[PDB]
């Protein structure tokens, strides 16, 4: 690996490396050596874990997960690896060097902070000091995080403290305003929930039909007398056929609503009881043999689930609004409960008897009824500590960005502080534009929208500027342009006697000009529109080998006859031409018009979980594509541009979301942003707590930062 | 646990491999206990016991 | 026949288009009338623009600029011999010109570099270790954060970006 | 003109008054149709030698073989190279280095300085 | 606005808690070097490079309003001293500050006013090098620059 | 050149106001809802004599919901910045027509005296004001935004009775909230917010307008 780094350094000094997208050549180089040294550590790290014998007590502590980990084994047995500080290799402290022990500009691994040794062989002197540098960043990080998080937590508790669930189970604060109609939108307790799988998100419509449908045609497989017992006698029933056919009709409709609720296609939801483990407790105790024939009537199952559905009271009432509240609030548990306890599912898979099923119904009823949150509780305070706690956990400014772009979407506590304050001017605002279908599978369409979205000022497009003295173009000092002057004899042939003899000539960079796909008439029309008709412009052909633009300034002709004393106080036009030259650059906003410009990068996403679509088979599918990620805020206008998605275009900046999309859209975006920051550690803070947090800040339309 | 061959070993017919832990009717049938069985895990023995 | 005209500006624009067609004397060896063709071109442009605006004037000049290119006399020769009809010459929709050659490559090369600006941006980490228990792919990333720790020891976090799935080592 | 040209018109930012020793400024002569340079604090005036009065950016004055003095050849901290041939003198051994500037431009490319008193020659590769 | 605009050349100087910033060329004129050719020489005595010289050029143009040392001293006084009446004490007060409080380490007498001017100029030069990027910024922690 | 975009925009804003008219329930033609860009271009026969007062012609009436109580009227002023004078004539126009509500779409901005005058129009006919750029795209289609439905005063009465609340104790929403503006609701009215929920699947809220 060291020879391979010297090899990459040899390629780099030759000037021929060919840089990586969106990066300077040093970054391409730095990204590459960093890839090699990391791969070097991981290869020998994987070698040492293999080489360990069965009896290594060190491996026995790592494997139980008691204390310590794989990386420690890597460092003690193998090789410690590249140290870094602020996410980069050890800086050049002295003139172009880390220590006087090295040569100036020495990008090798060791010379800039790679530790070749293991803790067991001991570190060499330079490695020790670069290791002592890696030691500080962690000690300092510790002292800061303790102060900041102590403050963030106190402020948060101090807001929410008076929120609490009342005895009619609506959650209200001190002045008795309602926060939620039901706590956490279902009225369940957070300590009684569990992760569960939703059966009905099963891919393929045909596959769902096969596994769930209770057939009546009976395939010659001992039908009616296989699995089920006396049920062979109710095969002739019309009513039972129509009622189950009605059951399956609800399951297709539930499957359809459930696909709308979870568009991403995750089956993991928090719900009470865990119906599947209960069926197992039920099977295990009654001594149910799954090969022996069944002893259960299907209608007993279907109606029993209806009755249980009615017993699971979460909203007491009787009028149409209470029934709708009861029905919608425990929609997600109810569709889950029908899916688990399905007649075909029950009969084939779980094989439960009648006595076992009646008992099972009775426990779920008792556990669900026990799960409903206890009014009186302090819910507001409970939530602040569950939010406060992950701010305690990890990362202040450490870089682990793997989204192939800018560092942007600041990670960790400083980002949390921004959402918490609702900063009118975030340190790093962002915005994600998704692109319309056709323009998303093609690069060239993507390039054309990208250029329209970018914001570039003529100063960036200009290679160079010059100002010349040339009263007579017909004998211009710039003899090569002379061909153009003859080309523009008919270009207003009369007011050449009147226009100022001062000349501005601009030359444009050829690659950069082409990249924006601009044409000269666009520039001329832009500059004409900005300064006015007074600014007399001419330009050469876009296909000449030296792409050039020539600018003069025309007056008002008739009235300028030295009336009083020229109401300009006799400003020389050259001096004025600099002010035109200055402002022409600083002002001209072609394509993109405000604060975002072309800051772009363009990205291909195939890694993430984007563009999740439905297919006619019924199953979900991945749809890779081009998406545009910007580093700026202008959501109101940027939505209205063509082929930009008016649906999934989003921004991390909650103040701009407020302006455009109102208070409810803030409530969601802020939740996603708070969820997303907690999710970086992925300790998974329970959602009900963040809903409560968002509701308190968005409670009264106007944004109420907790400041 | 580290054990076996994630994603394709249990499908390699279940030569019990002893790694995976199974408990039934209050008796430990097979496997080895670790932090993922006993720790602060979402599905640890301790959570189920409560 | 060439369409009738009376405007003095239109007449001089034809004369200039004709004069541009006179460049390099190729018109002699072919023997094609540059004055009838320039008039037909100009009529076709005017049929597009319908006046003698700056935009028409810019188009006349760019038509002139195409005729006067020193590195591509073959474009003119193609117009002179009728390989390009005047109605086609009148419109620059059909691209711009690609027989001086190197500049077309360069514009292609520009089209490469902005496409180079699309390539990944900067792909990441790529440790490639454990297999995911969801979408059955090994393309995975790992996170190393909180060294020593308070009481949640530097455990190893592994995430499957392929479907946003995260699990721990052990 | 020709593509293989250059743009060093001689930006004469210095041409002080022969009398009061201060800077000359442009000003028009409409009578003679010629640019002239005059001191503001006095009548003295003289015609210009160029039609230019100001330029900006070149963007790539890559600035590769200027400012850096040959004597940098003496510095013990710079890497001596066994790589041969001063393209001027028939002698090997050169000190080399890179950028050493904040307008780093991204110039990763190496600059080599001959070290024997016969050249002081400064090339690039 | 429509002045020339360009703010990124306007080099000024804070003198020790003077209630107002002063343009650097005025300070040079207060030292007595009224000739611009001389001021330019004191900033950079290697005028083979047009770019840096052009860079200072608008600040010389900005200075143009005054070209006498006495007036420049009265100017700094008004830019320093609370409002009053006579000009002459203001010139003297301004003179002792310019003499004693301006880089004392280079001298505290009349007879070394010229040498001080040289040090100011290397300092402006030291500044211009960083703005062109010819020379890396100083490090805020380099122990070599601590006592 | 930009003129050619305009047609897409004029098509595009007319379509958004149609959906807006349709959500309020003013019964627009399904075909007007269905109207494509190509048809609209066909409808004003694009390309001739630009800058022509297409928008004065684009001015449309919309009649309905459930009870034909006159109509709602939609006006696109030709002027980039509309002043009180254009409003006064427009007022003469709304009064002659005896219409009941007027929506004006201004291309850049309205003079503050006109907004004032719009304020003083409040007792009589109601005037609603949209900035052309925010109207140019249907915000209510966006994924962040849950389904909003306005309730009648009777339904609000039953709601407060059945939960036993005071008007004051409900969650509030801005009178200038882009969504509140979209429906054009006034103070005291309640909006029913219907949301997808990770844990409820569906969750229903109400917000009293403040
Ligand atoms: Zn996966
Ligand atoms: Zn003079
Ligand atoms: Zn030599």
Tab-separated table of N, CA and C in Angstrom, chain A residues 12-13 15 24-26 29 96 103-105 107 463-469 471-472 477 480 501-502 546 572 574 578 581, chain D residues 1-2 7 26-29 33-35 51-59 75 77-79 98 100 104 106 108-110:
chain	number	residue	atom	x	y	z
A	12	UNK	N	0.452	12.075	-9.800
A	12	UNK	CA	0.041	13.446	-9.506
A	12	UNK	C	1.059	14.501	-9.899
A	13	UNK	N	2.333	14.254	-9.628
A	13	UNK	CA	3.367	15.212	-10.002
A	13	UNK	C	3.573	15.300	-11.525
A	15	UNK	N	1.286	15.585	-13.608
A	15	UNK	CA	0.188	16.404	-14.118
A	15	UNK	C	-0.622	15.685	-15.196
A	24	UNK	N	-11.402	19.821	-6.875
A	24	UNK	CA	-10.093	20.244	-7.350
A	24	UNK	C	-9.176	19.035	-7.404
A	25	UNK	N	-8.051	19.165	-8.095
A	25	UNK	CA	-7.185	18.019	-8.308
A	25	UNK	C	-6.520	17.537	-7.008
A	26	UNK	N	-6.181	18.445	-6.091
A	26	UNK	CA	-5.711	18.006	-4.770
A	26	UNK	C	-6.741	17.179	-4.027
A	29	UNK	N	-6.801	13.865	-5.484
A	29	UNK	CA	-5.615	13.205	-4.960
A	29	UNK	C	-5.816	12.806	-3.492
A	96	UNK	N	4.774	24.472	5.001
A	96	UNK	CA	4.483	23.280	4.199
A	96	UNK	C	4.859	21.921	4.818
A	103	UNK	N	10.689	16.471	4.905
A	103	UNK	CA	10.954	17.359	3.746
A	103	UNK	C	9.779	18.304	3.459
A	104	UNK	N	10.013	19.464	2.848
A	104	UNK	CA	8.870	20.316	2.555
A	104	UNK	C	8.001	19.666	1.499
A	105	UNK	N	6.684	19.750	1.689
A	105	UNK	CA	5.720	19.133	0.780
A	105	UNK	C	6.021	17.654	0.642
A	107	UNK	N	3.726	14.480	0.765
A	107	UNK	CA	2.416	13.901	0.932
A	107	UNK	C	2.344	12.437	1.295
A	463	UNK	N	-13.551	35.933	-19.126
A	463	UNK	CA	-12.126	35.665	-19.032
A	463	UNK	C	-11.313	36.914	-18.718
A	464	UNK	N	-11.592	38.014	-19.414
A	464	UNK	CA	-10.870	39.261	-19.174
A	464	UNK	C	-11.590	40.482	-19.714
A	465	UNK	N	-11.249	41.641	-19.163
A	465	UNK	CA	-11.788	42.911	-19.628
A	465	UNK	C	-10.689	43.909	-19.949
A	466	UNK	N	-10.984	44.800	-20.890
A	466	UNK	CA	-10.066	45.862	-21.266
A	466	UNK	C	-10.846	47.097	-21.691
A	467	UNK	N	-10.262	48.269	-21.461
A	467	UNK	CA	-10.843	49.509	-21.952
A	467	UNK	C	-9.910	50.308	-22.860
A	468	UNK	N	-10.381	50.592	-24.069
A	468	UNK	CA	-9.531	51.145	-25.115
A	468	UNK	C	-9.986	52.512	-25.611
A	469	UNK	N	-9.031	53.312	-26.064
A	469	UNK	CA	-9.329	54.569	-26.738
A	469	UNK	C	-9.457	54.394	-28.247
A	471	UNK	N	-11.763	56.337	-31.066
A	471	UNK	CA	-12.716	57.222	-31.753
A	471	UNK	C	-13.162	56.731	-33.129
A	472	UNK	N	-12.244	56.136	-33.882
A	472	UNK	CA	-12.531	55.704	-35.247
A	472	UNK	C	-12.450	54.185	-35.372
A	477	UNK	N	-7.351	50.300	-33.451
A	477	UNK	CA	-6.072	49.744	-33.004
A	477	UNK	C	-6.073	48.222	-32.855
A	480	UNK	N	-7.328	42.905	-35.541
A	480	UNK	CA	-8.063	41.674	-35.795
A	480	UNK	C	-9.583	41.856	-35.751
A	501	UNK	N	-16.156	57.928	-27.901
A	501	UNK	CA	-14.987	57.263	-28.482
A	501	UNK	C	-14.344	56.257	-27.531
A	502	UNK	N	-14.875	56.131	-26.315
A	502	UNK	CA	-14.374	55.147	-25.354
A	502	UNK	C	-14.909	53.744	-25.571
A	546	UNK	N	-11.416	33.322	-31.141
A	546	UNK	CA	-11.308	34.189	-29.974
A	546	UNK	C	-12.641	34.888	-29.710
A	572	UNK	N	-16.118	62.017	-16.886
A	572	UNK	CA	-15.443	61.358	-17.998
A	572	UNK	C	-16.038	59.974	-18.202
A	574	UNK	N	-14.880	57.039	-19.943
A	574	UNK	CA	-13.951	56.099	-19.317
A	574	UNK	C	-14.148	55.831	-17.818
A	578	UNK	N	-15.760	52.306	-16.306
A	578	UNK	CA	-15.451	51.415	-15.184
A	578	UNK	C	-16.646	51.161	-14.288
A	581	UNK	N	-18.532	48.876	-16.173
A	581	UNK	CA	-17.836	47.590	-16.153
A	581	UNK	C	-17.975	46.855	-14.830
D	1	UNK	N	-5.015	38.615	-37.205
D	1	UNK	CA	-3.938	38.110	-36.362
D	1	UNK	C	-4.006	36.580	-36.315
D	2	UNK	N	-3.446	35.976	-35.270
D	2	UNK	CA	-3.326	34.519	-35.218
D	2	UNK	C	-3.629	33.989	-33.814
D	7	UNK	N	-1.222	38.218	-24.965
D	7	UNK	CA	-1.787	39.482	-24.512
D	7	UNK	C	-0.963	40.137	-23.402
D	26	UNK	N	-5.795	59.662	-17.644
D	26	UNK	CA	-6.273	59.897	-19.005
D	26	UNK	C	-7.184	61.120	-19.077
D	27	UNK	N	-7.332	61.651	-20.284
D	27	UNK	CA	-8.249	62.746	-20.581
D	27	UNK	C	-8.400	62.869	-22.088
D	28	UNK	N	-9.527	63.387	-22.559
D	28	UNK	CA	-9.779	63.323	-23.985
D	28	UNK	C	-9.210	64.584	-24.614
D	29	UNK	N	-8.690	64.452	-25.832
D	29	UNK	CA	-8.540	65.555	-26.770
D	29	UNK	C	-9.496	65.367	-27.947
D	33	UNK	N	-8.351	64.215	-31.602
D	33	UNK	CA	-8.857	62.841	-31.677
D	33	UNK	C	-7.837	61.861	-31.103
D	34	UNK	N	-7.232	62.245	-29.983
D	34	UNK	CA	-6.148	61.482	-29.369
D	34	UNK	C	-6.238	61.484	-27.849
D	35	UNK	N	-5.934	60.344	-27.251
D	35	UNK	CA	-5.896	60.261	-25.804
D	35	UNK	C	-4.598	60.917	-25.352
D	51	UNK	N	-3.432	52.483	-26.582
D	51	UNK	CA	-4.845	52.847	-26.530
D	51	UNK	C	-5.496	52.278	-25.277
D	52	UNK	N	-4.724	51.507	-24.522
D	52	UNK	CA	-5.241	50.881	-23.318
D	52	UNK	C	-5.014	51.753	-22.099
D	53	UNK	N	-5.927	51.669	-21.139
D	53	UNK	CA	-5.823	52.462	-19.923
D	53	UNK	C	-6.104	51.605	-18.703
D	54	UNK	N	-6.533	50.370	-18.939
D	54	UNK	CA	-6.942	49.484	-17.856
D	54	UNK	C	-7.276	48.090	-18.368
D	55	UNK	N	-6.832	47.082	-17.628
D	55	UNK	CA	-7.173	45.698	-17.917
D	55	UNK	C	-7.497	44.981	-16.615
D	56	UNK	N	-8.160	43.834	-16.721
D	56	UNK	CA	-8.497	43.044	-15.545
D	56	UNK	C	-8.577	41.553	-15.843
D	57	UNK	N	-8.008	40.754	-14.944
D	57	UNK	CA	-8.017	39.295	-15.039
D	57	UNK	C	-7.277	38.787	-16.271
D	58	UNK	N	-6.825	37.550	-16.273
D	58	UNK	CA	-6.100	37.008	-17.426
D	58	UNK	C	-6.479	35.612	-17.113
D	59	UNK	N	-6.839	35.546	-15.848
D	59	UNK	CA	-7.364	34.377	-15.170
D	59	UNK	C	-6.237	33.354	-15.068
D	75	UNK	N	18.283	26.418	0.088
D	75	UNK	CA	17.503	25.910	1.219
D	75	UNK	C	17.585	24.400	1.500
D	77	UNK	N	15.983	22.486	3.330
D	77	UNK	CA	14.770	21.713	3.609
D	77	UNK	C	14.079	21.185	2.359
D	78	UNK	N	14.426	21.781	1.219
D	78	UNK	CA	13.897	21.397	-0.086
D	78	UNK	C	14.538	20.126	-0.599
D	79	UNK	N	13.751	19.279	-1.260
D	79	UNK	CA	14.258	17.975	-1.710
D	79	UNK	C	15.230	18.025	-2.912
D	98	UNK	N	6.494	22.935	-4.983
D	98	UNK	CA	5.218	23.162	-5.631
D	98	UNK	C	4.419	24.293	-5.023
D	100	UNK	N	3.369	26.701	-3.312
D	100	UNK	CA	3.834	27.572	-2.242
D	100	UNK	C	3.092	28.896	-2.278
D	104	UNK	N	-3.395	28.948	-4.939
D	104	UNK	CA	-2.786	27.668	-5.294
D	104	UNK	C	-3.182	27.223	-6.709
D	106	UNK	N	-4.505	25.203	-8.017
D	106	UNK	CA	-4.697	23.764	-8.154
D	106	UNK	C	-3.465	23.205	-8.874
D	108	UNK	N	-0.771	21.357	-8.941
D	108	UNK	CA	-0.070	20.265	-8.284
D	108	UNK	C	1.277	20.024	-8.968
D	109	UNK	N	1.432	20.602	-10.154
D	109	UNK	CA	2.592	20.368	-11.004
D	109	UNK	C	3.875	20.903	-10.352
D	110	UNK	N	4.970	20.165	-10.509
D	110	UNK	CA	6.250	20.501	-9.889
D	110	UNK	C	7.071	21.531	-10.641
